[PDB]
Design an enzyme around this catalytic site. Structure first.
Site, PDB file in Angstrom:
ATOM      1  N   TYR A  14     -28.001  12.035 -40.159  1.00 22.49           N
ATOM      2  CA  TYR A  14     -27.368  13.366 -40.057  1.00 22.49           C
ATOM      3  C   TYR A  14     -27.934  14.236 -38.928  1.00 22.49           C
ATOM      4  CZ  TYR A  14     -25.797  18.116 -41.459  1.00 22.49           C
ATOM      5  OH  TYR A  14     -25.256  19.381 -41.499  1.00 22.49           O
ATOM      6  N   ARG A  19     -18.732  14.759 -26.488  1.00 21.44           N
ATOM      7  CA  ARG A  19     -18.149  14.683 -27.845  1.00 21.44           C
ATOM      8  C   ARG A  19     -18.784  13.582 -28.738  1.00 21.44           C
ATOM      9  NH1 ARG A  19     -14.734  12.525 -24.204  1.00 21.44           N
ATOM     10  NH2 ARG A  19     -14.208  10.344 -24.628  1.00 21.44           N
ATOM     11  N   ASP A  79     -18.011   4.736 -24.759  1.00 23.55           N
ATOM     12  CA  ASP A  79     -17.321   6.005 -24.993  1.00 23.55           C
ATOM     13  C   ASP A  79     -18.366   7.110 -25.019  1.00 23.55           C
ATOM     14  OD1 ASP A  79     -15.325   7.870 -25.236  1.00 23.55           O
ATOM     15  OD2 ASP A  79     -14.641   7.275 -27.244  1.00 23.55           O
ATOM     16  N   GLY A 111     -13.528  12.045 -37.625  1.00 24.19           N
ATOM     17  CA  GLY A 111     -13.584  11.320 -36.362  1.00 24.19           C
ATOM     18  C   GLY A 111     -12.394  10.401 -36.192  1.00 24.19           C
ATOM     19  N   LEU A 133     -19.090   1.285 -30.867  1.00 24.99           N
ATOM     20  CA  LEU A 133     -18.114   1.424 -31.898  1.00 24.99           C
ATOM     21  C   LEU A 133     -16.661   1.479 -31.414  1.00 24.99           C
ATOM     22  CD1 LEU A 133     -19.048   1.445 -34.808  1.00 24.99           C
ATOM     23  CD2 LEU A 133     -18.478   3.870 -34.840  1.00 24.99           C
TER      24      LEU A 133
HETATM   25  C1  LIG Z   1     -20.146  11.347 -35.565  1.00 21.36           C
HETATM   26  C2  LIG Z   1     -19.206  12.280 -36.319  1.00 21.36           C
HETATM   27  C3  LIG Z   1     -17.734  12.120 -36.147  1.00 21.36           C
HETATM   28  N1  LIG Z   1     -17.251  11.120 -35.294  1.00 21.36           N
HETATM   29  C4  LIG Z   1     -16.645  10.055 -35.634  1.00 21.36           C
HETATM   30  O1  LIG Z   1     -16.423   9.772 -36.832  1.00 21.36           O
HETATM   31  C5  LIG Z   1     -16.294   9.135 -34.461  1.00 21.36           C
HETATM   32  C6  LIG Z   1     -16.241   7.748 -34.624  1.00 21.36           C
HETATM   33  C7  LIG Z   1     -15.962   6.857 -33.571  1.00 21.36           C
HETATM   34  C8  LIG Z   1     -15.756   7.314 -32.269  1.00 21.36           C
HETATM   35  C9  LIG Z   1     -15.465   6.334 -31.145  1.00 21.36           C
HETATM   36  C10 LIG Z   1     -16.299   6.558 -29.898  1.00 21.36           C
HETATM   37  C11 LIG Z   1     -15.765   4.883 -31.502  1.00 21.36           C
HETATM   38  C12 LIG Z   1     -13.991   6.455 -30.841  1.00 21.36           C
HETATM   39  C13 LIG Z   1     -15.823   8.706 -32.088  1.00 21.36           C
HETATM   40  C14 LIG Z   1     -16.100   9.599 -33.157  1.00 21.36           C
HETATM   41  C15 LIG Z   1     -16.873  12.994 -36.807  1.00 21.36           C
HETATM   42  C16 LIG Z   1     -17.356  14.005 -37.657  1.00 21.36           C
HETATM   43  C17 LIG Z   1     -18.722  14.192 -37.867  1.00 21.36           C
HETATM   44  C18 LIG Z   1     -19.669  13.372 -37.252  1.00 21.36           C
HETATM   45  C19 LIG Z   1     -21.118  13.653 -37.490  1.00 21.36           C
HETATM   46  N2  LIG Z   1     -22.037  12.649 -37.457  1.00 21.36           N
HETATM   47  C20 LIG Z   1     -23.342  12.934 -37.636  1.00 21.36           C
HETATM   48  N3  LIG Z   1     -24.220  11.894 -37.596  1.00 21.36           N
HETATM   49  N4  LIG Z   1     -23.746  14.231 -37.843  1.00 21.36           N
HETATM   50  C21 LIG Z   1     -22.837  15.261 -37.890  1.00 21.36           C
HETATM   51  N5  LIG Z   1     -23.268  16.556 -38.104  1.00 21.36           N
HETATM   52  C22 LIG Z   1     -22.561  17.726 -38.272  1.00 21.36           C
HETATM   53  C23 LIG Z   1     -21.153  17.779 -38.251  1.00 21.36           C
HETATM   54  C24 LIG Z   1     -20.454  18.989 -38.445  1.00 21.36           C
HETATM   55  C25 LIG Z   1     -21.143  20.191 -38.671  1.00 21.36           C
HETATM   56  C26 LIG Z   1     -20.347  21.482 -38.829  1.00 21.36           C
HETATM   57  O2  LIG Z   1     -19.392  21.553 -39.607  1.00 21.36           O
HETATM   58  N6  LIG Z   1     -20.681  22.523 -38.033  1.00 21.36           N
HETATM   59  C27 LIG Z   1     -21.250  23.782 -38.555  1.00 21.36           C
HETATM   60  C28 LIG Z   1     -22.165  24.440 -37.492  1.00 21.36           C
HETATM   61  O3  LIG Z   1     -22.774  23.473 -36.617  1.00 21.36           O
HETATM   62  C29 LIG Z   1     -21.847  22.658 -35.872  1.00 21.36           C
HETATM   63  C30 LIG Z   1     -20.483  22.461 -36.567  1.00 21.36           C
HETATM   64  C31 LIG Z   1     -22.558  20.151 -38.677  1.00 21.36           C
HETATM   65  C32 LIG Z   1     -23.254  18.934 -38.485  1.00 21.36           C
HETATM   66  N7  LIG Z   1     -21.515  14.951 -37.708  1.00 21.36           N
END
Ligand SMILES: Cc1c(NC(=O)c2ccc(C(C)(C)C)cc2)cccc1-c1nc(N)nc(Nc2ccc(C(=O)N3CCOCC3)cc2)n1
Length: 261
Positions: free
Chosen positions: A82, A131, A127, A17, A148
């Site tokens: 998660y 996404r 935000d 992220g 955040l």
């Molecule tokens: C939240 C999240 C980020 N984001 C950030 O870190 C983020 C932080 C701050 C911001 C602001 C608005 C402040 C600028 C924006 C983004 C990135 C990556 C994973 C995650 C993530 N979090 C949570 N709680 N759960 C998952 N789950 C998840 C991620 C990837 C997969 C994956 O690799 N796949 C495989 C098939 O399914 C979908 C994609 C599966 C589940 N991913």
């Protein structure tokens, strides 16, 4: 607030992220967690830690839950619920997953529920976007990373002209004057409905970020996406009045999503 790293296992990567590397593993041995490793120089670190008390305390079954933080180290870790399908924006575009008008209004119903909560706790996302929504096993959309935005260091993200900024989601009172309120949140909400219904299409996909801020000034609105009834659309469009006093609440937008179910 605080969490013991010893209780954290890392198993699988989750990508990246704004605040850098994010992983998946186990809290206290058993539970399923998303772990942000906050890259150096990305976060206004002090301000976060201080104010994070108030983010911990936010609890609704439609907000990705902040389980807690690890500050007694660097990199600093954030510990969250998660969600299993990742990004809503991607769950929209998996080309091999068709939807129905009702499934879509359901996602908007999820999102509206969480923002209603926030609106009564007087706390801003800033935000809101596909996404920054995510999806659990039972395909429920929850709101992720509320408030955040305040703590990013990266002028491309902070500064209203910056490449990385949420132009396409922001009302004019933001684009010009950086003037966030409940109502600047609402504006992004309607944009997000459009997102849902267009199956993850770039809004105003025609114009650049800069070209957009121009046209929004001039009273450009997003058109009805093909999958939306004039009923749904009268809802999103209400999100996009010029004067922010005349934008609805989240409480009204929740009523109106029922009115149409
Ligand atoms: C939240 C999240 C980020 N984001 C950030 O870190 C983020 C932080 C701050 C911001 C602001 C608005 C402040 C600028 C924006 C983004 C990135 C990556 C994973 C995650 C993530 N979090 C949570 N709680 N759960 C998952 N789950 C998840 C991620 C990837 C997969 C994956 O690799 N796949 C495989 C098939 O399914 C979908 C994609 C599966 C589940 N991913």
């Amino acid at each position: 607030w605080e969490i013991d790293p010893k209780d954290l296992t890392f198993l699988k990567e989750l990508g990246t992220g704004q605040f850098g590397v994010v992983k998946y593993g186990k809290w206290r041995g058993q539970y399923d967690v998303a772990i942000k490793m906050i890259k150096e120089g990305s976060m206004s670190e002090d301000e976060f830690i201080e104010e994070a008390k108030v983010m911990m305390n936010l609890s609704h079954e439609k907000l990705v839950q902040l389980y807690g933080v690890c500050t007694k180290q660097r990199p600093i870790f954030i510990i969250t619920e998660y969600m299993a399908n990742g990004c809503l924006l991607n769950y929209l575009r998996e080309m091999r997953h068709r939807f129905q008008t009702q499934q879509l209004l359901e996602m908007c119903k999820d999102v509206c529920e969480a923002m209603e909560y926030l609106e009564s706790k007087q706390f801003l996302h800033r935000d809101l976007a596909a996404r920054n929504c995510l999806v659990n096993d039972q395909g429920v959309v929850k709101v992720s990373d509320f408030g955040l935005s305040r703590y990013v260091l990266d002028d491309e993200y902070t500064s209203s002209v910056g490449s990385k900024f949420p132009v396409r989601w922001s009302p004019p009172e933001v684009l010009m004057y950086s003037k966030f309120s409940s109502k600047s949140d609402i504006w992004a909400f309607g944009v997000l409905m459009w997102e849902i219904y267009s199956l993850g299409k770039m809004p105003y996909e025609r114009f650049t970020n800069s070209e957009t801020a121009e046209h929004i000034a001039q009273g450009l609105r997003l058109y009805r996406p093909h999958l939306a009834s004039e009923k749904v659309y009268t809802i999103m469009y209400s999100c996009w009045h010029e004067k922010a006093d005349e934008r609805p609440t989240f409480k009204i937008l929740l009523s109106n999503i029922l009115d149409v179910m």
